[PDB]
Symmetry: C3
Subunit: 193 residues, 3 copies
């Protein structure tokens, strides 16, 4: 776990991420990659600073998600091919096993998937919370209902109704260092008790 | 497998389970832990002999289920923290990987989950059957439709319609050594042929 | 991966598969095994050359699927028991982990499951495509929507509406060396670009 934190520091340096804004969609299911990348693509085209890391939940779907990215005409590099995030990279497909912590440790904001699909149900938001990443989930989070509600009650997690709202919320967070600082603070409160 | 049987004998002794009634909810999904623990909590509060082992199907949900237990105000100890079943323990969260056989080998009765949720579908009831544990499933068992029907046809498995009925059935089994002996007998018939 | 290809050559020889027609249902979910085996059983009874390999997606379901086969009165041998395909074998239950490539490498035609059930969603068709196996999927393939559509657009994958249609399509492929040769050709086109 902590090994991932220091590998993230090595990669932050080698990939020159200091002047990139890294947004991550984590543990995604269909049609979440299509919907969020479609909503985000105008910004990835207009603002080369942004880059989206995509971590699909199911490995059998990695090539499927590469095709989604390709069809959206987004420049996409792949962890499975030992690629890195280039200045040119718009989407980094993190198509490997066991490295979710590394990607969260590199992220400015994230979205935890399994939560915009139907029927959905959600995935564990504690991992990005612990790494101080502002976190968005969709409305279908019932497999983690207790924990997500503990965080909604303390204004510690952001709930999106659709893929457009995930992108709104992300762009707002990236523009609002004070709001994101307060969100990470409230998360740390819930996490401690 | 057989290693789990003898470890169960060691733990039965060290945890003084001879005067506890161990009920297990195994391979559970949301909202099965909430629903069954809610139905059972009055009995766990009134009768300190009872203790419920909870084995959620998905490891990413272990901390979620701990929160469910905590909110129900039930005294809960965790395998992941190297805890044991205390006299005070009301719920033992078996939040570890690969040890389902151990928990069934410690159980007086069980419920096999994935079967009260929607759409459900069920999990493998053969494991508790082979270990001579009286077994309850919910009505949504269609992923194991053939095998569960073979056992319903020989009165060898108990079907619950809801979480209240799982608890009724369990309390009845625990009060009825002759009925539970006959159930385990009928299960062994199906298992042999 | 390539190790599986040469093991397939060893088994093709030892099991005398040269005069069998091997049809495979791969990564199946309930009720796909029941539905397809029911549709196929008249042919497996009338034409001893045919044999169906069954590879259920979830290992916990292997004994369940054995029971499905047994109830259909089909002669069934099991990889887990170190069995082989006999002249007498009608269904080979490939109840082992990690060997899907071997079975596709032995197949004349296949069906990729998770795609006739509800709500379905499908599994990765690239694996049989790469091994030159004519491939059928059901209509519920939305987890692989992009890739399956790339193959439908080039007439490179067969879509079945129900279990009867999977069996129609298979029997037609086996009777049509020219059509199956053209299908494998179109698949290889999509795969190259």
């Amino acid at each position: 776990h902590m090994a991932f934190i220091k590998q993230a520091a090595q990669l932050h340096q080698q990939w020159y991420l200091e002047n990139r804004q890294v947004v991550t969609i984590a543990s995604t299911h269909a049609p979440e990659e299509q919907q969020i990348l479609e909503a985000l693509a105008p910004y990835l085209n207009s603002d080369r600073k942004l880059v989206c890391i995509v971590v699909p939940r199911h490995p059998e779907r990695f090539d499927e998600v590469f095709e989604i990215c390709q069809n959206l005409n987004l420049i996409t590099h792949r962890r499975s091919m030992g690629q890195s995030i280039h200045a040119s990279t718009q989407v980094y497909l993190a198509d490997s096993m066991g490295e979710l912590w590394l990607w969260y440790a590199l992220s400015q904001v994230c979205f935890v998937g399994g939560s915009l699909n139907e029927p959905g149900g959600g995935h564990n938001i504690l991992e990005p919370m612990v790494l101080n990443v502002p976190t968005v989930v969709g409305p279908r989070y019932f497999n983690f209902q207790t924990i997500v509600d503990e965080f909604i009650d303390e204004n510690a997690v952001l709930i999106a109704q659709d893929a457009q709202q995930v992108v709104d919320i992300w762009l707002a967070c990236l523009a609002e260092p004070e709001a994101t600082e307060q969100l990470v603070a409230q998360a740390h409160k819930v996490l401690q008790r």
